Design an enzyme around this catalytic site. Structure first.
Site, PDB file in Angstrom:
ATOM      1  N   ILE A  99       0.842  -1.170   0.000  1.00 21.39           N
ATOM      2  CA  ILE A  99       0.000   0.000   0.000  1.00 21.39           C
ATOM      3  C   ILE A  99       0.870   1.209   0.000  1.00 21.39           C
ATOM      4  O   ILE A  99       0.739   2.085   0.853  1.00 21.39           O
ATOM      5  CB  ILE A  99      -1.052   0.007   1.133  1.00 21.39           C
ATOM      6  CG1 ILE A  99      -0.481   0.075   2.550  1.00 21.39           C
ATOM      7  CG2 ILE A  99      -1.938  -1.237   1.039  1.00 21.39           C
ATOM      8  CD1 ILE A  99      -1.565   0.410   3.567  1.00 21.39           C
ATOM      9  N   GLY A 100       1.768   1.239  -0.980  1.00 24.47           N
ATOM     10  CA  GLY A 100       2.750   2.302  -1.069  1.00 24.47           C
ATOM     11  C   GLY A 100       3.915   2.030  -2.004  1.00 24.47           C
ATOM     12  O   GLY A 100       4.294   0.895  -2.264  1.00 24.47           O
ATOM     13  N   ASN A 101       4.467   3.110  -2.529  1.00 22.68           N
ATOM     14  CA  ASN A 101       5.698   3.060  -3.295  1.00 22.68           C
ATOM     15  C   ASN A 101       6.180   4.504  -3.377  1.00 22.68           C
ATOM     16  O   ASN A 101       5.451   5.363  -3.892  1.00 22.68           O
ATOM     17  CB  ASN A 101       5.486   2.422  -4.678  1.00 22.68           C
ATOM     18  CG  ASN A 101       6.584   1.429  -5.013  1.00 22.68           C
ATOM     19  OD1 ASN A 101       7.761   1.763  -4.898  1.00 22.68           O
ATOM     20  ND2 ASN A 101       6.216   0.196  -5.392  1.00 22.68           N
ATOM     21  N   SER A 140       9.805   7.523  -2.271  1.00 20.89           N
ATOM     22  CA  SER A 140      11.236   7.894  -2.283  1.00 20.89           C
ATOM     23  C   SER A 140      12.009   6.888  -1.459  1.00 20.89           C
ATOM     24  O   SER A 140      12.951   6.255  -1.940  1.00 20.89           O
ATOM     25  CB  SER A 140      11.461   9.303  -1.698  1.00 20.89           C
ATOM     26  OG  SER A 140      11.274  10.312  -2.666  1.00 20.89           O
ATOM     27  N   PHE A 141      11.568   6.786  -0.204  1.00 20.68           N
ATOM     28  CA  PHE A 141      12.023   5.816   0.809  1.00 20.68           C
ATOM     29  C   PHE A 141      12.215   4.359   0.312  1.00 20.68           C
ATOM     30  O   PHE A 141      13.321   3.984  -0.079  1.00 20.68           O
ATOM     31  CB  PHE A 141      11.123   5.906   2.067  1.00 20.68           C
ATOM     32  CG  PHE A 141       9.676   6.372   1.824  1.00 20.68           C
ATOM     33  CD1 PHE A 141       8.722   5.531   1.251  1.00 20.68           C
ATOM     34  CD2 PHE A 141       9.258   7.655   2.239  1.00 20.68           C
ATOM     35  CE1 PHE A 141       7.412   5.953   1.073  1.00 20.68           C
ATOM     36  CE2 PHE A 141       7.943   8.081   2.052  1.00 20.68           C
ATOM     37  CZ  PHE A 141       7.019   7.227   1.471  1.00 20.68           C
ATOM     38  N   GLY A 142      11.189   3.522   0.397  1.00 23.09           N
ATOM     39  CA  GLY A 142      11.015   2.423  -0.536  1.00 23.09           C
ATOM     40  C   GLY A 142       9.546   2.051  -0.529  1.00 23.09           C
ATOM     41  O   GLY A 142       8.676   2.920  -0.627  1.00 23.09           O
ATOM     42  N   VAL A 143       9.270   0.770  -0.338  1.00 25.05           N
ATOM     43  CA  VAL A 143       7.909   0.224  -0.436  1.00 25.05           C
ATOM     44  C   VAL A 143       7.252   0.286   0.932  1.00 25.05           C
ATOM     45  O   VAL A 143       7.920   0.074   1.907  1.00 25.05           O
ATOM     46  CB  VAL A 143       7.960  -1.269  -0.850  1.00 25.05           C
ATOM     47  CG1 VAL A 143       6.570  -1.763  -1.245  1.00 25.05           C
ATOM     48  CG2 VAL A 143       9.015  -1.513  -1.944  1.00 25.05           C
ATOM     49  N   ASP A 153       9.088  17.992   6.419  1.00 24.50           N
ATOM     50  CA  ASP A 153       8.024  17.486   5.545  1.00 24.50           C
ATOM     51  C   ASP A 153       6.681  17.487   6.302  1.00 24.50           C
ATOM     52  O   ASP A 153       5.903  16.532   6.239  1.00 24.50           O
ATOM     53  CB  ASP A 153       8.372  16.097   5.019  1.00 24.50           C
ATOM     54  CG  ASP A 153       7.594  15.720   3.755  1.00 24.50           C
ATOM     55  OD1 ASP A 153       7.085  16.595   2.992  1.00 24.50           O
ATOM     56  OD2 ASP A 153       7.530  14.494   3.517  1.00 24.50           O
TER      57      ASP A 153
HETATM   58  C1  LIG Z   1       0.724   2.631   5.187  1.00 28.18           C
HETATM   59  C2  LIG Z   1       1.509   3.937   5.243  1.00 28.18           C
HETATM   60  C3  LIG Z   1       0.784   5.109   5.945  1.00 28.18           C
HETATM   61  C4  LIG Z   1       1.458   6.458   5.691  1.00 28.18           C
HETATM   62  C5  LIG Z   1       2.699   6.597   5.061  1.00 28.18           C
HETATM   63  C6  LIG Z   1       3.264   7.865   4.863  1.00 28.18           C
HETATM   64  C7  LIG Z   1       2.578   9.008   5.243  1.00 28.18           C
HETATM   65  C8  LIG Z   1       1.329   8.890   5.850  1.00 28.18           C
HETATM   66  C9  LIG Z   1       0.791   7.634   6.073  1.00 28.18           C
HETATM   67  C10 LIG Z   1      -0.658   5.145   5.450  1.00 28.18           C
HETATM   68  C11 LIG Z   1      -1.846   5.050   6.350  1.00 28.18           C
HETATM   69  C12 LIG Z   1      -3.271   5.066   5.815  1.00 28.18           C
HETATM   70  C13 LIG Z   1      -3.416   5.561   4.375  1.00 28.18           C
HETATM   71  C14 LIG Z   1      -3.394   7.092   4.393  1.00 28.18           C
HETATM   72  C15 LIG Z   1      -4.769   5.082   3.865  1.00 28.18           C
HETATM   73  C16 LIG Z   1      -2.311   5.063   3.438  1.00 28.18           C
HETATM   74  C17 LIG Z   1      -0.920   5.315   4.008  1.00 28.18           C
HETATM   75  O1  LIG Z   1       0.021   5.666   3.338  1.00 28.18           O
HETATM   76  N1  LIG Z   1      -1.665   4.908   7.667  1.00 28.18           N
HETATM   77  C18 LIG Z   1      -0.430   4.723   8.147  1.00 28.18           C
HETATM   78  N2  LIG Z   1      -0.103   4.423   9.422  1.00 28.18           N
HETATM   79  N3  LIG Z   1       1.314   4.294   9.493  1.00 28.18           N
HETATM   80  C19 LIG Z   1       1.842   4.531   8.271  1.00 28.18           C
HETATM   81  C20 LIG Z   1       0.741   4.799   7.421  1.00 28.18           C
END
Ligand SMILES: CC[C@@]1(c2ccccc2)C2=C(CC(C)(C)CC2=O)Nc2n[nH]cc21
Length: 340
Positions: free
Chosen positions: A27-29, A31-34, A144
């Site tokens: 659920i992501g991709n 700068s950092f990584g995955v 950021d």
């Molecule tokens: C899974 C990663 C995430 C995140 C990553 C970077 C910035 C903000 C949130 C993230 C969510 C819910 C989301 C907004 C639907 C998708 C998403 O990127 N919640 C999180 N909790 N801890 C990291 C996260």
């Protein structure tokens, strides 16, 4: 399918343990990584896992930073571990999952042509200022701050600062890259190419969030590098000679703060804005001063409840780390009704 790894707790003694998770979905991709989401088999809690290729030459800046941090309003590092077939080593950070963000919520209100109720603005901004009071106390600047990086539990109103991939211990003396933060939230020093900037860039950024929440859209949606300053100036008027010199070494009048926001905007919200969105970095409130501000007095009311009727989350459980920069403010911040 079940995945079991040997992971070191983020805060706590440096002894590895078997950690097991399932329901792993990308659920992501970035700068950092995955980034993956997953469920820990022990607790059943949800977690985010950021995987980043790490040369064993280098120590990882984000990890070094996350290990220092324990705070109610900062996304916890639960665990970290490594994984692999070209002799690639990947660092995995295992973090609190939080379902929503301030961007997503703020967008729901905007796409339905509405304002977010001032109470949530108080709650969110207050907890944002704590998270920054606390990280700046180590000389760590986030770099950021923006609504997409403010995690949010809608039921509890708990806000959590996340994504430290741009964050960095600032060292007086050593230059720092100037093209950092997202544009709309970027302090004017940085636009001007300063490399000697302070953690007060996060405060300008936080001011941009406040205003966004009051306005229903970003306050300074600039075009480029330098048009971003034009947009700023549209509102703040042209900075004076001194203000420029204080930032780093085209004439419009300051549009009066009052007339920026829709009417019936609380005057102390606008007051706070004006004390965060200052040209001169040192003229900006500290995070802690900002929490002390009158705008947040309703939170120090002992009857204050969530709209859904529940108790507010933790607002006063301050540490000495957190009170570092001005301990006399404890008298204003921790109000009479909550000690023992
Ligand atoms: C899974 C990663 C995430 C995140 C990553 C970077 C910035 C903000 C949130 C993230 C969510 C819910 C989301 C907004 C639907 C998708 C998403 O990127 N919640 C999180 N909790 N801890 C990291 C996260």
């Amino acid at each position: 399918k079940v995945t079991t790894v040997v992971a070191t707790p983020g805060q706590g003694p440096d002894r590895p343990q078997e950690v097991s998770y399932t329901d792993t979905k990308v659920i992501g991709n970035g700068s950092f990584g995955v980034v993956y989401q997953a469920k820990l088999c022990d607790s059943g809690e949800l977690v985010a896992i950021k995987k980043v290729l790490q040369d064993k030459r280098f120590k990882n800046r984000e990890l070094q930073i996350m290990r220092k941090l324990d705070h109610c309003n900062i996304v916890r590092l639960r665990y970290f571990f490594y994984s692999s077939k070209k002799d690639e080593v990947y660092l995995n950070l295992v973090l609190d999952y939080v379902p929503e963000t301030v961007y997503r919520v703020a967008r729901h209100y905007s796409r339905a042509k509405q304002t977010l109720p001032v109470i949530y603005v108080k709650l969110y901004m207050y907890q944002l200022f704590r998270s920054l009071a606390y990280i700046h106390s180590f000389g760590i600047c986030h770099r950021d701050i923006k609504p997409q990086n403010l995690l949010l539990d809608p039921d509890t109103a708990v806000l959590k600062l996340c994504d430290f991939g741009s964050a960095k211990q600032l060292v007086r003396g050593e230059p720092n890259v100037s093209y950092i933060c997202s544009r709309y939230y970027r302090a004017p020093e940085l636009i001007f190419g300063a490399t000697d900037y302070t953690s007060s860039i996060d405060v300008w950024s936080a001011g941009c969030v406040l205003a966004e929440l009051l306005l229903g859209q970003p306050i300074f949606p600039g075009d480029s590098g330098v048009d971003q300053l034009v947009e700023i100036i549209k509102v703040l008027g042209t900075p004076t000679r001194e203000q420029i010199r204080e930032m780093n070494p085209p004439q419009i009048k300051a549009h009066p703060w009052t007339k920026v926001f829709r009417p019936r905007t609380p005057p102390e919200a606008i007051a706070l804005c004006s004390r965060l969105l200052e040209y001169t970095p040192t003229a900006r409130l500290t995070p802690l001063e900002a929490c002390a501000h009158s705008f947040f007095d309703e939170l120090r009311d002992p009857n204050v409840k969530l709209p859904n009727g529940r108790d507010t989350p933790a607002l006063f459980n301050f540490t000495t780390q957190e009170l570092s920069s001005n301990p006399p403010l404890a008298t204003i911040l921790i109000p009479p009704h909550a000690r023992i």
